[PDB]
Each structure stands twice: as C-alpha cells, then as structure tokens.
With several copies, the nearest count.
Chain A
C-alpha cells in the first residue's frame, strides 16, 4: 500500500526517496549504517503515528532547520470498498469521513466522474516535520486520520539474531488484528454455565470455585484483546526459522478476506541456518504465495485476487537472493545502499528481472555473488580466469584482490545488463581486437564486425546541439568508417604487417570506448604472457620442466642408462635416446650420484641441442616467439590461428616446421599445448619465485614484473587506481 518514502536531512540522509515497492523487496549492501538509519526512520514515523513519546532523530547538517519524513499510501481498494452502494456499515461511513470526504467536497460534477475510470489510483500523503528545537509538526492536524492510517497499514518488525523463541506476542497480535468476528456477543455467564455443567458431580460447583477464585484474585478487568486471545487459545489445540516461517505463512493466509495490508521488515533471516535451510524457507514462502493466487484459468474456492502485503528483508547470504530471484521473478526487486564521496547514504535499484529462461534456470552461486562486489571484471575465455586469479601474483597487489572476475558471454552480458547498476557496482569489460576488426589474406582489406557497428551507432548521437569537445570524437568515428576498406600490405605470406601497427588503432579505440567501460587488449592473454622480454624465463621454465619432471621409466636407472648410451649415439641420436629414456611422471625418485651425474649430462646435452636447433632454424627473436604463441593455440599480427591457417591454406613452410617441432624433441610439451591445461599457473609461479629470489625488495619485484609484463600489469594498475578512487564510497 505504501508507495513512497522520502527523508530529508535526517541521520545519514540528505534527500532520499524510495518508490516502486514490490511484494518481495530485498535490500543488500555494505553500508549497514544506512539500513539501520532507514529502520530507525520507519520505526520513529510509526511510533509518532500512534502518539508515543520518543526521542527525535538527529540532523545530518546543522546549517538547516527542518527534517522531513513523507509517506504516501495507495488508498485505492479502500476507496472502492467504501464508496459502493452495497456497503452501509458503520466502519465504511466512518472511513468516508477523514480520508475521502475533505478532498471530494471541493470538487465538482465533471471531475468526480473522471475519477471513477477504473484505471486511476488514489493517494494519501502524510508529512512529519522535526524542527531545530525538537518540535514535531504534521501536515494534517487531526489525530483521527493518523489513528485510522495506523490501524489500516500496520508495521511489523522482526529481528532474527536476538529473537526470543519463548515469546509469541507477534503471533497473537497478528491473529487479533486479522479477525472477522465480534467476540463481544459471547455471554460470560452462559459459557461458565456450560463449563460447569460439563464438569460437575453436583449442579453448581464450578461456578462456586470460579467465584471464590475471583473474590481474591480481584484485578483489572480483561481488555477486548485479552479476551479474544483467551478464546483463540481455548479454541486451538496447541501453543528461529520455524518462528519466522509461521509468521510469514500466517500473515499470508489471514490477509486474504480483509482490507488490511501490513508491512513486515525482517532483519537477517539466514542467521545460523544451513544454506539448504534458507533455500527451503524461500521455496516454502513462494509455494504459500502461489497457492492463494487466482489468475486467468486458475479459479475456484480458496483462490483470491486480494493484493499481497509488502515484505522487506535484509540479507548477507547469496543463497536467499538467488532463490528469491529464481522463484518470484517479476514480483521482486533488489536495493543497494552504498555511500557518496562526502559521505551520505544512497539508494539504487539493481536489475534482477531476466527475459531469458535459460539464464534463470542455470542461475547459480556465482551470479548471486556478483551482487556482493565492489568491482567486477568481465572476461570471455577461461585463460583470463586462470591469470587474474593467481595467488602469487595477487600477493603483490593488495588492491586487485578486492575485485571479482566473471566469465561472461554476449547474451550473458545482455541479460545481466551491468550498465543499469553503474554508480553502485563499477565494472570493466575486457575483450580482444578480433571482435571489432577482421583481416583476410586473399583480399588485403579489413572488415568491421557488427559489434563495432553497434558501438559506432551508440556513440553517434543525433538531435544534439554544438559542443566544443564533441566534434573531434565524431571525426574519429568517421575515421573508423574509413577503415571499412583500409587496404594494407602483409609480408612473409600473410604472417606479419609491413606497416599500420595495431597498437595505435587499439589505443584510439580504447580512448573512444573508455566512456562505455570497455578495454580491448592488443593481443591474447598468452600473447602478453610470452613476449620478447619473457623468452629467457620461458626457456628457463622449460629447462626446469626437463630437469625435474622427466624420470627414468625403467626401475633400474643405471643399467637402462648404460644400455641406451651403448645403443644410441650420444650426439647424433640424442633425440631417440631422450624419447626412449625420459618420461613424464608425477613421482621423481632420487638416483645414485653417478646416475644423477649421467642424467644431468644427458639433460644438459639435450638442452644445448634444442637451443641450438631453435636458434638456427628460426631467424631473429621474432619468429620463435610467434612459433611458440601459435603453438599454444593462439594468433599473432594477422589474427590467424594455427588451425585457421590450415583452413585458409597459407604459410605451408611455417606450418610444416611447427608440425615437425611438435613431433620431435618438444614432444613432452604436447599435453600443455592444449587450452585450459595449466601451463599459465606454473609459468607464473616459476617466474614469481625466480624474481623474488633474485630481487629482495617488494618494489623492485613489481618493477621487474611491469617490465616483463606491460599489458596485464597496466590493466591491474588501472583497475587498482579506479578501486582506490572509489574506495571511500563502497566501504562499510
């Protein structure tokens, strides 16, 4: 029923407004002070409605003199009920004396008809003002109106942490308020006579006992509520999670044949509960909600069209949020509090309605965890997860550990729609330059993918006036259209670019798209992992893998090594010896000193042979890097993968040489060549260990990491700077 709550200059609120209340309104956030202040404001307003003496609230700033609390009630159902010719009770006529009479006698005969269109809504506004000298003022100077509003829209507050399970006062109050019987017609004497006749060895014995008890227990007479409570207790057969479930179920069941719509606030429903217990609680609430719904074909006795009461609950558990989003759907909303730069509570709505049914069905804990984050990094592949979640790398940057990295697709991004919740949850979308520009070998021209066209259309804004810093960007947009053909020349048979470096184009795209919270990496993640400055570390890691992982297959190492040395040549036939001697094994047994020396000599000879072969077969320190990058399922320069080149039929010599290298000395790396194998983590750990062994100070290691890895370190630094800039707001 309540549709608007407005607070001005009170506690931690400067000017806050809340509207659009659903049935299952949910509140999450990191600023618990704001939630506590909102609860205090609501309780203070409802206490002042009942004429109770309480301490006035404090002001946010002393440069003002007033504090306002405004409530709007949707008095539509009551207006329809009261103003009907079929209703002639005392209560209806009394209601049409303080709610809909003052605002109707001032109208005329042409607008009263227009107010009965069966599509309009009637609102009642009540404002409470607190002055500087602790004075309370109301917009309506009539206590009867306040009493009627209080008795028509009760407020119930439940605390789950500090709850007394032995007290059932809320249950009794809810039962007494939601009744349709007049208990005053029951004759006390008749009931006493009935009981006395029921239990008696002589007529008139229970009456004498009751009279004797009353003659000495003489106290104040029972009130009406006490009498109805006693009658309910004598009528029923019996007297943390169970209490709350009973409260909610009773509230839903009783509020079906009455025009009283309570509002219930629940604080932390998941205190001391198993996650399955919370899920079952939400599911039971949803089932009770759906049992009493009469929509379209669903009809019959026991099904009603009465509106349900509004429910507010604050939680810190993703399970309850997940269940609420999956089950209720259109009948729920999520509120986020946060803070401001100078310090002031905010209120924002987080999108929680998804059109796609698959997304709702496959909804899991990660999606709910995305809600409880202050910075989200969206990535597409599974290698970005392996890189950005490294424990050793995150140890040196205690600012990027506060972000959450999520694998998102185009449809997933569309369904989530992070743009709606932008000021509450900052985010960055990291993609590749392949999604925008596509290059071909046969026809030496670029092409623009539809995502680039959509971004250009979004950036191009019409129906606008002139701005100084607006035309230049548009010019760049035009330049992007000029990249429609963009004829370029490729050397080494479509393997490299003679000119037109993609770095400048990527930088310009990033500068343009920074307003849309997007970042386009120049190359793939593994492209940044292995580059010209990290090749020595990659070679050292390969050498360490050879030294450690490779073990003698035969249980006796000395005899096998001697036989293979006397059988195969140590220099010309080194490759067959390495293939037939050393194998990859999890266990690494320790051999004899002579055996260890022989194995070390063989490994050193193999390392020297492979180093000489790779340095001789390939020219400069630019083809080895490309060969390694293309071997681990990647692409470089021309945006062509190893598999794509075979389909396109180009660079036969390069592919043949790579295939020869794969079916030769580098045969132990074949399992790690596949994507999502685990080489990224091992390489990162080895590099971190080497650098922290070489350099002692915690700043020199970070500087060397930045030197070796410019791109990922730049991304991490930018994200950390953004988080630190917005740290004062998203922190409890």
Chain B
C-alpha cells in the first residue's frame, strides 16, 4: 500500500483532524494531559482518553494501514491467525530446547527505526503547507514523550493500540537474520512477542553452548536490543514453558508431544472441587477466581441491592465458559496437528464433561 495526501483526509482523519487542513495548522502531538500512568508492578502502562482525536486515528490506522504490510512467519503474536500453540507446535520435532527473552522490548525501539520502516509505504510530500510532512503527521499519533526520562525523545508506549503492529513491523529484519542464521545450523526458531524458542532435532550440544547465545546477542546488537541472563533455559528431552510441557527423546525421525502440567490446571481443579463440595459462591469467587465487587461501585445508581447471588453466579459461569473454550481450543489444535498425548486427551475430556455438568447444575439450581 502507498498512503498519499488524499488518503489521510478521507480514511485516516475523517472528522478528527479535518479542521486542521483548511486552517493550515500543524497537527499537535499527544500532550501529557491526554494520557494516564497506570502502574502494575515494576511496569508503567500509558493509557489514552477514549474521547480524543488520536484514538480514532489509531483505530483507523490499525484497520486500514497497519494490517497490509508484510511480516515474517516466525512471528506468532499480534497477527491474524496466530496463537501460542502455533508458537510451540514446530518444536515437537526437536530433541534439544533453548529459550531466550528480550529485555525491555517496547522501550528499546528507537523512533528513527519506526520512521524508516514505514517510509517506503508513505510517499514523500507535504500535508499541511510547507511546514509538516505526512510521515511526521502520521507518526505524531503513534508516539509519546516519556516524562520519566526527559533525556530520551519520543518512545512507543506499551499501553497504546498501534504498538503491537509497529513492534511486529520494525522487528522484521532481525527475524530474517535470525532465521537465516538458524537455517544453516538446522535449528527451528519461533518468536512470540519478545520470547524466542529454539529447537534442535539432531543430537548435539549447540543449544547448550555459549556460542549460540553470543551469536544471538551479536545479531540483536544491531538494533541495540539485549537479552536478560535471568531467563536463560536450555534442556534436553523435555522442557516446561509456563505449564506447557514439550517432550521428545528421539533417535531419528521422532515426533514429540505437548501437554499441560498439573500445576497449570490446579486452579480449575480447586474450583471444581469447591463447587462439588457445596462451598458457597461467596468464598469461591473471592478465593480462587479473585473477582470482587467493591463497595465503591456496588450498584452506585441503585439502592435495591440484593443481587449478589446473580452477579457472582454469572461471573462463575463466565469463568467456567472461558476455561472450557480454552480446553476446546486445545482439543481443536490436537485435531488439526495431532501432537498431544493421549492420556492428557482423556484427562481434558473428563474435565470438560465435569465442567459442563457443573454448569448445567448451576443453571438448574438458579432456575429452582
């Protein structure tokens, strides 16, 4: 695609910035008054006001501009049709497994690289007189000046909406270089967000050597990215990644298996046991699911109250339905790729039957 001057007027800015073209005034940047500082742990999330000119521009950019630029197949995140299961599937054919993590992936993206990457897809011209360019006007809606580090310029906040697409587009040459490096070594490589998974099917100690991590660091140093040494994992014949266990011993042409550990399914089993033990819903939605109805918003517009038994019940039903959908997704992945252990299939079938029976019992009790 090639966005021109007319495209920004009839597609990208239909009613939010239409008054800044006839007036011949430059499009302003995002001020500090239009963003929040939501914090969770040692992370900062930059939110944006819903009633802002830039939010609709971001929506239009995501739907019409940042959805046609080609990507690399090694990226399994923030794309149409990607999933974590597709991120773990290709490595069932390997015997050695290695994992790497990128440190501060969204904070180390230089805005110059973003400007250069989107340059071929936007023509070189002037939007508002001989004062502002189209590329700069578009970039003013996808960047924010961090007040925490005044020395730094304009960065890509984590909490915006166009950030994942920009991260995928910018981190494309690195994916190509890493894939080319791994192809010559016979190593399967996949990437999800900023986590890289490497699999070796042959019997070798390449993934357990410092040479591999040194080469990956050298490749990443072109864009200034770094990998933290606190999340370096390298194992053989089995690996656990956030409860997903991939196992393959293999001597020649062997196919591994993917399952989920019991620690991954501990919470749902506890919820099922509590529900079958006639535990009241008050101590189930607050102890296991961790969903609470705060007194600051307990029907702020209604003094009738006496609706807790419905709110908690429907929240529990939503939780069980979501977990059932997750298990159904796993079953569909097994059906389409056939890389799940049979005993785990039996276990998840039993769990699904139990969950469905509990949902039916909850509905019947609510009716009665």
The A122-143 residues at the B interface (CB cut-off 8 A) are 123-127, 129, 131-132, 135, 137, 139-142
> Quick one: which of A102, A141, A142 has the most chain B CB within 10 A?
A102
The A419-473 residues at the B interface (CB cut-off 8 A) are 462-466
Q: Across the A-B interface, how many residue pairs have beta carbons closer than 8 Å?
A: 89
Let me know if B180 and A131 touch, CB within 8 A: yes
Interface of A is mostly: loop
Decide yes or no: A463 and B176 within 8 Å by CB, A63-B70, A125-B93, A129-B186 being known contacts. no
Residue A98 interfacial (CB < 8 Å)? yes
Residue B321 interfacial (CB < 8 Å)? yes
Q: Which residues of B contact A61 (CB under 8 A)?
A: 70
Expressed in whole angstroms, the Cα–Cα distance for A9 and B176 within the complex equals: 14
Looking at the assembled complex, report how far the CB atom of A342 sits from the nearest CB atom of chain B, in whole angstroms: 10
Let me know if B179 and A123 touch, CB within 8 A: no
Name the residue on B nearest A142 (C-beta). B252
Give A358-395 as 1s and 0s: 1 = Cβ < 8 Å from B's Cβ atoms.
Answer: 00000000000000000000000000000000000000
Name the residue on B nearest A126 (C-beta). B253
Expressed in whole angstroms, the Cα–Cα distance for A139 and B253 within the complex equals: 8
Q: Which residues of B contact A72 (CB under 8 A)?
A: 255
Let me know if A65 and B180 touch, CB within 8 A: yes
* Candidates A63, A103, A127, A465; contact of B93 at CB < 8 Å: A127
Decide yes or no: A137 and B183 within 8 Å by CB, A106-B251, A125-B255, A126-B253 being known contacts. yes
Give A9-26 as 1s and 0s: 1 = Cβ < 8 Å from B's Cβ atoms.
Answer: 100000101010000000
Looking at the assembled complex, report how far the CB atom of B242 sits from the nearest CB atom of chain A, in whole angstroms: 23
Decide yes or no: A65 and B186 within 8 Å by CB, A126-B253, A463-B321, A465-B325 being known contacts. no
Give B241-284 as 1s and 0s: 1 = Cβ < 8 Å from A's Cβ atoms.
Answer: 00000000111111100000000000000000000000000000
Decide yes or no: A63 and B321 within 8 Å by CB, A103-B254, A140-B252, A145-B252 being known contacts. no
Residue B318 interfacial (CB < 8 Å)? yes
Let me know if A125 and B318 touch, CB within 8 A: no
Let me know if B183 and A65 touch, CB within 8 A: yes
Give A77-116 as 1s and 0s: 1 = Cβ < 8 Å from B's Cβ atoms.
Answer: 0000000000000000000001101111111000000000
Expressed in whole angstroms, the Cα–Cα distance for A334 and B93 within the complex equals: 30
Let me know if B254 and A65 touch, CB within 8 A: no
Name the residue on B nearest A137 (C-beta). B186
Expressed in whole angstroms, the Cα–Cα distance for A462 and B255 within the complex equals: 37
Looking at the assembled complex, report how far the CB atom of B330 sits from the nearest CB atom of chain A, in whole angstroms: 16
Residue A691 interfacial (CB < 8 Å)? no
Let me know if B253 and A63 touch, CB within 8 A: no
Residue B172 interfacial (CB < 8 Å)? yes
Residue B324 interfacial (CB < 8 Å)? yes
Let me know if B70 and A66 touch, CB within 8 A: no
Q: Which residues of B contact A616 (CB under 8 A)?
A: none
Residue A587 interfacial (CB < 8 Å)? no
Looking at the assembled complex, report how far the CB atom of A632 sits from the nearest CB atom of chain B, in whole angstroms: 45
Q: Which residues of A contact B73 (CB under 8 A)?
A: 8-9, 15, 64
Q: Which residues of A contact B310 (CB under 8 A)?
A: none
Let me know if A463 and B324 touch, CB within 8 A: yes
> Quick one: which of A15, A105, A123, A465 has the most chain B CB within 10 A?
A465
Name the residue on B nearest A130 (C-beta). B183
Expressed in whole angstroms, the Cα–Cα distance for A61 and B179 within the complex equals: 14
Let me know if A64 and B252 touch, CB within 8 A: no
| Count, chain A residues at interface, CB 8 A | 40
Q: Which residues of A contact B70 (CB under 8 A)?
A: 61, 63
Let me know if B356 and A465 touch, CB within 8 A: no
Q: Which residues of B contact A466 (CB under 8 A)?
A: 314, 318
Residue B72 interfacial (CB < 8 Å)? yes
> Quick one: which of B184, B253, B338 has the most chain A CB within 10 A?
B253
Give A525-558 as 1s and 0s: 1 = Cβ < 8 Å from B's Cβ atoms.
Answer: 0000000000000000000000000000000000
Looking at the assembled complex, report how far the CB atom of A6 sits from the nearest CB atom of chain B, in whole angstroms: 10
Name the residue on B nearest A3 (C-beta). B338
Let me know if B356 and A66 touch, CB within 8 A: no
Decide yes or no: A123 and B251 within 8 Å by CB, A61-B70, A131-B183, A135-B184 being known contacts. no
Q: Which residues of B contact A106 (CB under 8 A)?
A: 249-251
Residue B359 interfacial (CB < 8 Å)? yes
Residue B53 interfacial (CB < 8 Å)? no
Residue B88 interfacial (CB < 8 Å)? no
Residue B201 interfacial (CB < 8 Å)? yes
Q: Which residues of A contact B120 (CB under 8 A)?
A: none
Name the residue on A nearest B176 (C-beta). A65
Expressed in whole angstroms, the Cα–Cα distance for A99 and B254 within the complex equals: 10
Looking at the assembled complex, report how far the CB atom of B111 sits from the nearest CB atom of chain A, in whole angstroms: 23
The B290-323 residues at the A interface (CB cut-off 8 A) are 314, 317-318, 321-322
Expressed in whole angstroms, the Cα–Cα distance for A123 and B252 within the complex equals: 11
Let me know if B186 and A102 touch, CB within 8 A: no
Give B187-204 as 1s and 0s: 1 = Cβ < 8 Å from A's Cβ atoms.
Answer: 000000000000001100
Can you spell out 27 A-B residue pairs with CB atoms less than 8 angstroms apart? A8-B73, A15-B73, A17-B336, A19-B338, A61-B70, A63-B71, A63-B172, A64-B73, A65-B180, A72-B255, A99-B252, A101-B251, A102-B252, A103-B249, A103-B251, A104-B251, A106-B249, A125-B93, A127-B93, A132-B183, A137-B184, A139-B93, A463-B324, A464-B321, A465-B321, A465-B322, A466-B314
Closest 9 CB pairs of A and B: A102-B251, A103-B251, A465-B321, A102-B252, A124-B253, A465-B318, A65-B179, A125-B253, A65-B180
Q: Besides A129-B183, A137-B184, A139-B253, 17 other CB < 8 A contacts?
A: A9-B73, A17-B337, A63-B72, A64-B179, A65-B176, A103-B253, A106-B249, A106-B250, A123-B253, A124-B252, A131-B180, A131-B184, A139-B202, A141-B202, A142-B252, A463-B321, A463-B359
